[PDB]
């Protein structure tokens, strides 16, 4: 067994981390004080959940997590909320003065003063690992901490652990729920610094999670709590193969093998189905076919785009609940004829499939209902370039006038980094268009 360290950066990172770990605990039977009656082997184990938990002499299970925010409010909620005892205080790191939505304040100004402390705590966590796999890193694109300090951290992790895979969970900015006008700046900036340091990032446009929570959870104005519960449903679908018995995606290296042939194009599209209101009085349970079919409906994607006008490079289907290979192959056969699924010529048309018999776990008092079967499709499709297009466009709109640039220079950056990141994004957009369009 090999271990995975989670790192949550900035407000969105820390909150989504909360949600995920709460979910992990419910799924694994781990109580809020760290006691897992399921675990007969006390003080240690060579089990699959040990990928994400370490065991104490007192039989306590503690996440391989680090929360880091340059500002104390959200990690103080963690330090006082329901899952106090779960975490070692040395793992919850705060500053006193945030990065004021300013990438340059997080990367240079405030980052330089806290990166060494963050890396020492991360190494004190790696030091309880027989064979560390790598890192899951949760952050936002739009935040000052979430972009600046995250990319500095990714740099340093590459240089200290050059042989460990690194996975990102990025929160793409959406105007309905975004805080700041310079989120398109930070986004581009941090992507340019992190592209060569990340092995597979899973973008999540807030806009999508928002419309899903409106249409399907029947929530009027969704909050961060709703978004984060749904996002953790997805994250757990994507990380279950690490914490459970199985032969698909059983280590971080398999993710870049099954989903990333070209290393620059490492942003897979996650599509999750079915999302059903816990308040639905009467609900008819969807078949394998109905949820596999829903996987190809853009209204169910973490990023609104149209895969019909891109080409696919790799597809993986992750089922939780009552599913059997027969019905998956049947559904696929039907869907290939009913849908438009074009692969790149240099890649076989087909699906790597994973079934876990344990149906989705839902938070008591959440908004999602229990279902008999659910699925998450990870697909590396070029159509995701749309989300960069939009982003790049907004970027240009401001930079054309050098608007807000002085806030970044004030912290020590150089206009050159703006242009150089933008050019990198231009390369990335063009690469997507090479691989995909005709």
């Amino acid at each position: 067994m090999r271990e995975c360290i989670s790192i949550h950066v900035g407000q969105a990172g820390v909150q989504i981390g909360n949600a995920c770990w709460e979910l992990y605990c419910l799924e694994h039977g781990i109580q809020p004080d760290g006691q897992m009656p399921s675990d007969k082997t006390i003080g240690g184990g060579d089990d699959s959940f040990n990928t994400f938990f370490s065991e104490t002499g007192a039989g306590k299970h503690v996440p391989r997590a680090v929360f880091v925010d340059l500002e104390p409010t959200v990690i103080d909620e963690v330090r006082t909320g329901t899952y106090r005892q779960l975490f070692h205080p040395e793992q919850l790191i705060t500053g006193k003065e945030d990065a004021a939505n300013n990438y340059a304040r997080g990367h240079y100004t405030i980052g330089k003063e806290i990166i060494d402390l963050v890396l020492d705590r991360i190494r004190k966590l790696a030091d309880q690992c027989t064979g560390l796999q790598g890192f899951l890193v949760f952050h936002s694109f739009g935040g000052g901490t979430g972009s600046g300090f995250t990319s500095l951290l990714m740099e340093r992790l590459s240089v200290d652990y050059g042989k460990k895979s690194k996975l990102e969970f990025s929160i793409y900015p959406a105007p309905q729920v975004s805080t700041a006008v310079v989120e398109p700046y930070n986004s581009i900036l941090t992507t340019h610094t992190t592209l060569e340091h990340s092995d597979c990032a899973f973008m999540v446009d807030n806009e999508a999670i928002y419309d899903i929570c409106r249409r399907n959870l029947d929530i009027e104005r969704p909050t961060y709590t709703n978004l984060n519960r749904l996002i953790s449903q997805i994250v757990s679908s994507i990380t279950a193969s690490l914490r459970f018995d199985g032969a698909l995606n059983v280590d971080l290296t398999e993710f870049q093998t099954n989903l990333v042939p070209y290393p620059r194009i490492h942003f897979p599209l996650a599509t999750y189905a079915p999302v059903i209101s816990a308040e639905k009085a009467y609900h008819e349970q969807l078949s394998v076919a109905e949820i596999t079919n829903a996987c190809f409906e853009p209204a169910n994607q973490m990023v609104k785009c149209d895969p019909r006008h891109g080409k696919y490079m790799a597809c993986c289907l992750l089922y939780r609940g009552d599913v059997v290979p027969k019905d998956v192959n049947a559904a696929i056969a039907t869907i290939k004829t009913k849908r438009s699924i074009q692969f790149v010529d240099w890649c076989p048309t087909g699906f790597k499939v994973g079934i876990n018999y344990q149906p989705p776990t839902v938070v008591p008092g959440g908004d999602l209902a229990k279902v008999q079967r659910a699925v998450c499709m990870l697909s590396n499709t070029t159509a995701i370039a749309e989300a960069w297009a939009r982003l790049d466009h907004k970027f240009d709109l401001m930079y054309a006038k050098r608007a807000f640039v002085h806030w970044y220079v004030g912290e020590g950056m150089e206009e050159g980094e703006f242009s150089e990141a933008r050019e990198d994004m231009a390369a990335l957009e063009k690469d997507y268009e090479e691989v995909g369009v005709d």
């Binding site: 340059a104 240089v159 032969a247 698909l248 696929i332 240099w346 048309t349």
Partner: protein
């Protein structure tokens, strides 16, 4: 359309189905860049102090 590498366990199954075959910087470098931004930032602060001195 054929299955490949079916693996079964108590927790679930996993397999592949195929339909059609086909046709870094150092520590000193990042330390140097952080310190270059801190220098530019110090220079700006000094200019501000000079203008306020005047």
């Amino acid at each position: 359309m054929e299955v490949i590498e079916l693996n079964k366990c108590t927790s679930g199954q996993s397999f592949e189905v195929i339909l059609k075959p086909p046709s870094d910087p150092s520590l000193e470098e990042i330390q140097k860049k952080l310190e270059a931004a801190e220098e530019r930032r110090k220079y700006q602060e000094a200019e501000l102090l000079k203008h306020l001195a005047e």
